[PDB]
């Protein structure tokens, strides 16, 4: 069906959950057995959310090569994106690692540092510009260069560098700072602002690494994000937009992180977000 009519049968029959269970069922499962061995008990935030072995980002060192991260290649849409959760205490050199080793340019955060009065990730980034960061483990040096509050998201421009090497680069990063503790958005249109926002600065594009997005999990508000920025594009390319159905996208991207999407209510959200950007576009 198409997706702006097949969405109102769903409300009106009120089957969200229903759908929602389907995809549960039909979801892929691989092996995460890295994730699982002992030694990496304190670089995972949740027992239950894991990268499978196929698709996980390794770290280029010898001694423990494991960070919670996934590659997700889109290959129709010839977009990727790297899905994290966000960092703890101990893996904050990690992340940082990933950016350089990947060659990212932006960093996406949809979360808070502190929600529901709890600790939802590290503070992983400085705050005040003579106030940099050191992280000794990975050899690398973090400065804040620039911040923009907007009412929704902050973007802050970041530079970080190799110690090893002295080179530097710039990083973008994007910070949605208006999701509710509870619920979703009542209506996508900051998000999608964002998405665009994001767009605009070449985060997204081939001619860099693929740009890490995270949460709390990394499968939640970061499941709905690329999601929805895989839909609209393929709705650019093809000859007939009402082919694309959200369903089987969020199908073939769970074939590489578990659990994208966490709730029925963000998939509903997904839906409207795809539904209300096709039109802007034209």
Request: hydrophobic residues 35%; proline residues 4%.
């Amino acid at each position: 069906m198409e997706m702006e009519k097949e969405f109102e049968q769903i409300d009106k029959s009120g089957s969200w959950a229903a759908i929602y269970q389907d995809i549960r069922h039909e979801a892929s499962d691989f092996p995460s057995r890295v994730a699982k061995l002992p030694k990496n008990k304190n670089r995972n935030r949740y027992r239950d959310v894991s990268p499978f072995d196929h698709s996980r980002i390794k770290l280029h060192q010898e001694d423990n090569d494991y960070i919670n991260a996934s590659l997700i290649k889109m290959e129709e849409a010839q977009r990727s994106y790297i899905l994290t959760q966000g960092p703890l205490p101990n893996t904050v050199g990690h992340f940082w690692e990933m950016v350089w080793e990947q060659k990212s340019r932006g960093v996406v955060m949809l979360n808070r540092v502190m929600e529901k009065g709890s600790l939802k990730c590290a503070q992983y980034w400085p705050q005040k510009e003579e106030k940099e960061m050191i992280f000794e483990d990975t050899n690398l040096k973090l400065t804040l260069i620039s911040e923009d509050i907007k009412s929704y998201y902050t973007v802050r421009q970041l530079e970080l560098e190799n110690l090893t090497t002295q080179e530097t680069r710039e990083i973008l990063h994007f910070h949605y700072t208006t999701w509710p503790d509870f619920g979703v958005p009542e209506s996508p249109a900051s998000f999608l602002n964002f998405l665009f926002k994001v767009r605009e600065s070449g985060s997204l594009s081939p001619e860099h690494g693929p740009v890490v997005v995270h949460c709390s999990a990394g499968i939640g508000r970061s499941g709905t994000f690329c999601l929805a920025d895989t839909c609209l594009l393929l709705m650019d390319k093809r000859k007939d937009p009402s082919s694309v159905d959200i369903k089987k996208v969020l199908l073939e991207m769970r074939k590489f992180r578990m659990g994208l999407i966490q709730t029925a209510d963000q998939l509903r959200f997904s839906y409207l977000a795809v539904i209300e950007g096709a039109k802007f576009i034209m």
